[PDB]
Design a protein around this ligand. Sequence first.
Ligand code: CL
Ligand code: CL
Ligand code: ZN
Ligand code: ZN
Lengths: 30, 30, 30, 30, 30, 30, 21, 21, 21, 21, 21, 21
Amino acid sequence: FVNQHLCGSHLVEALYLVCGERGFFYTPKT
Amino acid sequence: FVNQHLCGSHLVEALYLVCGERGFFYTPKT
Amino acid sequence: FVNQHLCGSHLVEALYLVCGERGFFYTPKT
Amino acid sequence: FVNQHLCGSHLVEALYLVCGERGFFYTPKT
Amino acid sequence: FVNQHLCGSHLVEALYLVCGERGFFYTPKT
Amino acid sequence: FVNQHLCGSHLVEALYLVCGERGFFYTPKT
Amino acid sequence: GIVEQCCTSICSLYQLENYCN
Amino acid sequence: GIVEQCCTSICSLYQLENYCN
Amino acid sequence: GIVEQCCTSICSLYQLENYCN
Amino acid sequence: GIVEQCCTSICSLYQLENYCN
Amino acid sequence: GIVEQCCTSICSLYQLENYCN
Amino acid sequence: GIVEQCCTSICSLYQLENYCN
Ligand SMILES: [Cl-]
Ligand SMILES: [Cl-]
Ligand SMILES: [Zn+2]
Ligand SMILES: [Zn+2]
């Protein structure tokens, strides 16, 4: 896999793809 | 606003949109 | 809900989520 | 180009892509 | 159609919409 | 990581995410 | 409407332009 | 869970907020 | 307008809701 | 093909890499 | 190439169409 | 954190995987 540059909703999409059925938590700073 | 089916990546995109900086958890297993 | 920073297609996605069955109009400047 | 099913947010993303600066309306009720 | 400003995954979405069943190749520099 | 259904634009978004700078081909006809 | 034209049935990008302003 | 609430069934954006931190 | 506001500044869902049909 | 592998059936991100250049 | 052109400048759907299989 | 890292710098899928439940 390649390194990623992901901002905004793109990161969430990436988390979704990566974690599948496990889900994930999205925890921005501040 | 409205009630709609929100599935998969669209669901987490909506969570991103609603929660933003608070963050969120996506835990499909419950 | 949180405030949003939405450019490009992200705004349209947001309008879609917000307006649901009502639909919406997307009217950029110029 | 092609003909395809375009639904939901994918539909409005396509409208954004086709209309861009002209803007568009998404009016699912007709 | 309008001209496009597409970065990142947005370009791929655009290619997907444009090429439909034909598919496409995505070939960034470097 | 996980195995999931990846269809349509979501499929090519995943390919973008996995291949990135290598690029990829999306060839649904095979 | 657009949903019938493009989601339920299929449409081209040209037909999509019908819904631009 | 969220999938049942929002995907299988439908939910509002308010209900979506149930899953924020 | 809203398209520019949300991208150059911020905007709220409530502002967005004004653009629903 | 990819659609069969990943959409109709399921695939991993590793299998997705099969379609990179 | 097209990936850079569309992001640093603009590109058209017609240019994109060149990248279909 | 990861949300900032991936946007201001880069991040890997493997780093992302740490955020799965
Ligand atoms: Cl879908
Ligand atoms: Cl973006
Ligand atoms: Zn989708
Ligand atoms: Zn984006």
